[PDB]
Amino acid sequence: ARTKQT
Amino acid sequence: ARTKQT
Amino acid sequence: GPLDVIRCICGLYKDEGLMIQCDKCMVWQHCDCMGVNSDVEHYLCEQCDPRPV
Amino acid sequence: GPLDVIRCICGLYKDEGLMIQCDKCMVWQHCDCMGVNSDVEHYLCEQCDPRPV
Ligand SMILES: [Zn+2]
Ligand SMILES: [Zn+2]
Ligand SMILES: [Zn+2]
Ligand SMILES: [Zn+2]
Hints:
The complex is a heterotetramer, with two copies of chain A and two copies of chain C.
Chain A: E1 3-5
Chain C: E1 18-21, E2 28-30, H1 31-34
The complex binds zinc ion (ZN) (4 copies).
Residues 8-10, 12, 29-30, 33 of chain C line the site of one zinc ion.
């Protein structure tokens, strides 16, 4: 799955 | 612009 | 449809009435909630064009 | 970014913390709100795959 963290 | 009504 | 993202300021995920699509982010919103109707030429949602509604 | 649609069950349009994208409708949600973490291989939001959260 595609994840991010800004 | 693009509209709809279900 | 399942591929059509509803993201209105009311926060209800329901397909009723006249809705309008943001030209940029493609989400759908209820015209009544957004204070618009079906005769506008271009539309942007309240996140692509922040504003009071 | 402006063309990344955030539609989490919390209803807050903000980009913070670990976030995950639905595989079908492309919306982003907060992992903590949805009860998951990035170790999942595949993800669908609560509208593409209705379920209690
Ligand atoms: Zn609405
Ligand atoms: Zn938009
Ligand atoms: Zn959330
Ligand atoms: Zn989805």
